[PDB]
Structures are given as C-alpha cells and as structure tokens.
Structure 1
C-alpha cells in the first residue's frame, strides 16, 4: 500500500514532468527503473532535473499564492547530501544569504533529505527562518505573539531573548536520532531589516517599526512524486500588505493601528471615521516606501494581482487547468480593486505541492 501510493504518485509525476520538459520518450524507461528501485529499496531517488522541476510545480500548484507568475524561475538548491547539523545550519545560513542577495531577493528553495519510512532526517522547528520572538509575562505582551510557543520552546532549551519587541529567534532544528533539537543564534550580518518610515510624515519614525527583508517558510513539507521532503524551506519576496496589514496590524500580532493613528494625527474614537482603514493605508504606504528606499525587493498588492492575472492567462494558454483559494488570493486591503475579487477559483489540490505538517513544539 505504502509502495502502491508511492508508485502511483510517481507514475503520475514522471509522465507530467517529462512531458513538460519535452522528454516524453524517456518515461517508460525511467519508470521501469523506479519500479525496480521501489521493489528493492521501498523508495526512489529524484534526478536533479526532476527535483528542480517538481519544486517549481509545487509552487505553481500553491492555490493560496498570488505570486505564482514567477514559478519557473525558482532557484532550487539541492542539499540531499547533508548528514550533520553543522551542514544543516550552514545550508540555512547560505540560503538566507543567497536569497537575500543584498536586497535583490531571489526566490530560493533549499531541499534537505526526504522522509524514509516517513522517518524524518531533519525536522526544522522554525516557522520562518527569520522571525521575531514573542513573550507574554502576566499580561505584559512583548514582540510577536504568533511566535509565543516556539519562543518558550527555545527558552526551555537554553536560548534567552533580550526581550526587545524584535528579538531574532534562533534557528532551531532536530536531526534524526537526536531526542532534542539544537539552536544557533542568527548572525546579524545575515539578516537584512528595514525601518519603517513614511514618505510624508516624519513623526512616523517615532513608532520605531521595522521588519525583516525576506520571508522564508521553513515548516511546510514539499511532496513530489510520492516523496515527502519535510524540510525544504522556501522564499519569495514580500507583498507589502502582509507586513502592513497583517503582521503589523492584526490584534493578535503587533496591533499597531491606534498608534499609527495617533502619530498620523487622526482620532481613533469613532468607527465612522474609518480610522483603521486610514491608518492601514498610511502604514502600508510606509512599508512599500521603506523597502523601495532601502533597495529591498517588495511588491504592492495591485501590481501583484496584475502579475497574477498574467499567470492565469499563461496557464490557460499552456493548456493547464488553474487552481486557487480565493480566500487567500484576495488581498486584505482594497480586495475589490483587484480582479481576483470578481472571479472565482477552483480550490482543488494538484501535486506536486507544499503542505502543512504537525508542529513538534506544542
């Protein structure tokens, strides 16, 4: 059964991947080979080409991603060789550096060894590689609530944050055979960060907001032809709204709108003033401007959605069915000003793809 699901995912996967790559004749033989390898080993190993392209497909089938126009240019780094924690840490450091590229961000994915009998070789605990600690000590909230549980896990283990609102979490992961993960402080030279300033309103700096340059999702599994790469951290660049509208705005995260409001000189007393809407727009403007001012790559949600419309034309022109989760594609501000809003999307799962998995802390 295990063999059988694996075998089928593999057949589907190879046929489609080789078809896309104009390598259709080579399929019979490659499958034969795989049929033997799974017969013998109970698994099979991807070629470099298969793995690069699988990862590309997985991004392309990510229903919740608006920035899939650029799926085919994903930078794929194949680290299936790593056996030691030093190599993992160092692969992680490298990915941060190469993806950041001095602020001209490259969409990158580092792929570590797959699961064996569903036995993990590496288990990355961070949610993102770069992320801020969250504390809560008797109703004194500090930093990022979303990170509270992970943060108290690190602290268990030895780490100690400075309790700033933007403490950098360390990398923390576990190796097959170890009962505990290790952690390693993030070198600061690696992490680009941006202060938030407004183009017009100088008192805006008084807020002392900043955010990190690159979002690198480090806790989703990549599945490709029945192979489960549980550790395969990936990145793009940010759409502004995720910083300015979620991370900084949500009540459960940084909860900045009142302060935004106060410092932009509007009152926060009456819903009918639309002071949250208005703050949200100045804050999202502050975000794009600061990242563009710093030479760090970013997209606004309007631009992003025009990109995603090209993606839609291109799927269909390529004869590919489109999938999409409307609830995630629409941006959290001015969604009706994007075409995404006015159409519907088929939310089926096509593999290859990225998937959630259980957190090991909690």
Structure 2
C-alpha cells in the first residue's frame, strides 16, 4: 500500500491511511523499542519564526490565499516584528482560527465534531487580576446560557519576554473543595485538595460540605494571585435524581453544568497563551463514571450498590457494573430534566466517528488517543473501540504546563 500508517476499523472492515501525521513537527513519547501511549503526562528566534511561518501558512490555506500577496506580506511583517522585538502578535482572525485549530488538533477530545463552533473572546487587552475576573464571569455567563451551553474560550495576554505570566491557578473554573480530615479521609473532592489548601493559605474562608464551590485564584503578571468568589447565581448546578430509583435523590448528589478547563496552555504559531480557559459541555461518563465512581474521587459505588441491595461481597455479582450504570443514568436523566446540555457516551462516540470521516476527507487523518477517546464504561459497545487510531501532536495545540506555585 501507501507509505503512511494504515488504519483499520474492525467492526466495518474498512481501511484508511493517515497522511496528516506527516505534518507533525513535535515528537510524542513512543519509540520502535517501546510504546508509551498509555502514559498520562509524558515528561528561540529562528525557532519562533519557523513556528510562526508555519502557522501563517496554515491560516492562509484555511482562507485559501496561499501564495497570495496578502500571505507573503503577512510573513514579512511577522519576521520584521520578530526581528525587532523577539516576538510577534496575532491578528484577531488569526487568533480565532488558531484557537479552533487547537481544539481540532487535541487527540484526547471526543467532542471535536463541534470544533468549528467556538466562540472566541479576545481578552488580550487584560491588565489586572480584577479584569480577568470580569472576563471569566462574562465567559461563564455566555457559555452557561441558562443551560443551553455554548462552547467558548477566552484568551488572555500571551507570554512575554521577561514579564510574568497571566495564570488562573485553578484547574477548572468550577471545582468542588476537598478538605483533608483528622482521620486522613477527605470530605468533598479529593482531586482538589491542593487547590483547596492553596485557597485557604491565600485567605479563603473554607466551608465544610461535600460540594463547596472554590474561589478562583487569578494571577496577573508579576503579582501574587488574588482570590475571587464566584457569585453563586452564576454557577449553575444540577441536583442528581434517578428516573425510577426514588431514593437516589435522597443521596444529595449534585454536579455543576459547565466544564471549563483553566490550567492549559494554548500554543499558536510559537506564541504561548498561559491563561486561556475553555468550556464546552459534559459527556455523561465524565461525571457519572470518573468523578462520582473513581476510588480516588467521590467513590460512591458501594453506597449506591448497598441502596440497590446488591451483593457487594463478591466481584461476580457485577455489583459495580450495575451501580455505575444507574449512576450514569441518573446523571443523564437529571441534566435532561434540568435542560442543561449533556451528551451520553453512545451519541458522543457516534458523532466522533463522523468527525473521523469528515477529517479523513479534509486533512487525510485525525490525531486521536484511543485510550482517552473510548469511554470508561461500555467501551466495546461504542463504535470507537473498534476503530484503530494514530496519535500525534500537531500545532496549534493545548499543552499541559507546570503549576504556577
């Protein structure tokens, strides 16, 4: 065949070849001797200019003026600007295209069918922590939209030679506190124990419930982060109930509507946007399987199983599996009742399959991380399980970055 990875779907028997992976200029963690695809985090003048040129070239193809006069005049401004300053700045339309392209490029994201519909708020004029807060509130208001969620990103000023970074310290805009107890256990979300404790060191007065919304810790360049409490009425939440298990409501479980990731770096054309929070909507398994059932998260499986009167003393009852199903159903049912957008793992995966086909035609491939794309319950019941995937890093991209502290 062709000299590019051959990619097979074992359900359908169909074959494609990824030619896009050719465009990757950044190495992943695998070698011929060993595959490291399952690790979660694997561990410049001419350099900037060349990322810059490539990015501008991508922009000009996307509007189809490749080789044009406008294209070559932009390349020249970018070098001029780097020549005299070490950096450059993006046109507004370049930032919009780049932000959508970073989403499109994210191998781990199963919601990419939506990649073309992203509201980009340009906040590159922001000059204080107070102003970041207003921008974030506006973001949350627009995105939440009383339950009819809308994808969005708000982009704060880029990293700049020898000035401090803009950062949001929280990993998401909405997170529940986790309080370490005398007996070593955690009340709330154990994932958020470090951020919780940071908030307290910075003057936050902590509550003591299981679902306390954290304040944001926002850092403008060369300053200590400042603490901001989110108006409760801006944080839409969904109380959890089950469509037929009437006791489920009695458990007092809830989840917030808006997933908004705030600690990633958006890299476009070599420019680095250290604060660039983005939001979409939830796939139901993120709440109902990982957040509520991981043993290191809320860990509610056994409590639910006991309420369902299952035999929890033996693996072979499938008590875990039965409980997880029902918790997932409650999540979907409750969001539905509340009119808050949510997508189940079947509908998400079907639409990711359609994404794959669309991208096969547009770009000759789609970077995808199979372990993250396949959901955490009912894997082989989804069509993605049966689909081979090629994982690689393209840019623009969202990257992890180290923590500000």
Alignment match, 2:52? 10
Alignment match, 1:88? 132
Instruction: Tell whether the 8 Å contact from 2:265 to 2:273 is kept in structure 1 after alignment.
Output: yes
| 1:106 alignment partner, one of 135, 142, 150 | 150
Q: Say whether residues 1:201 and 2:245 are aligned partners.
A: yes
| 2:200 alignment partner, one of 130, 155, 167 | 155
In 2: Cα distance, 1:44 partner to 1:70 partner? 30
| 1:183 alignment partner, one of 227, 242, 258 | 227
Aligned pairs, how many? 359
Q: How does 1:1-362 map to 2 (within 5 A)?
A: 2-24=44-66, 25=68, 26-117=70-161, 119-138=163-182, 139-178=184-223, 180-361=224-405
Report deviation, 1:321.
2.4
SS of 2:53's partner is: helix
Alignment match, 2:5? none
In 2: Cα distance, 1:42 partner to 1:77 partner? 26
In 1: Cα distance, 2:309 partner to 2:164 partner? 53
Instruction: Tell whether the 8 Å contact from 2:163 to 2:222 is kept in structure 1 after alignment.
Output: no
Instruction: Tell whether the 8 Å contact from 1:207 to 1:259 is kept in structure 2 after alignment.
Output: no
In 2: Cα distance, 1:300 partner to 1:166 partner? 23
Runs of 4+ in structure 1 over 3 Å off: 118-121
Report deviation, 1:118.
6.7
Instruction: Tell whether the 8 Å contact from 2:153 to 2:276 is kept in structure 1 after alignment.
Output: yes
In 2: Cα distance, 1:23 partner to 1:85 partner? 39
Structure 1, residues 183-216: CA drift from partner, whole Å, max 9, x if none? 1111101000001100011011121100000100
TM-score, normalising length: structure 2 = 0.87
In 2: Cα distance, 1:120 partner to 1:345 partner? 39
Structure 1, residues 90-147: CA drift from partner, whole Å, max 9, x if none? 0011111100001000000000000012744311101000000101122242000000
SS of 2:115's partner is: helix
TM-score, normalising length: structure 1 = 0.97
SS of 1:109's partner is: strand
Report deviation, 1:327.
1.0
In 1: Cα distance, 2:181 partner to 2:289 partner? 26
Pair 192,118 (structure 1): closer, same or farther in 2 beyond 3 Å = farther
SS of 2:116's partner is: helix
Instruction: Tell whether the 8 Å contact from 1:120 to 1:230 is kept in structure 2 after alignment.
Output: no
Instruction: Tell whether the 8 Å contact from 2:291 to 2:297 is kept in structure 1 after alignment.
Output: yes
In 1: Cα distance, 2:249 partner to 2:314 partner? 25
Q: Return 5+ residue gaps in structure 2 as ranges.
A: 1-43
In 2: Cα distance, 1:175 partner to 1:250 partner? 35
What is the root-mean-square deviation of aligned Cα atoms in Å?
Answer: 1.0
Instruction: Tell whether the 8 Å contact from 1:60 to 1:71 is kept in structure 2 after alignment.
Output: yes
Q: Return 5+ residue gaps in structure 1 as ranges.
A: none
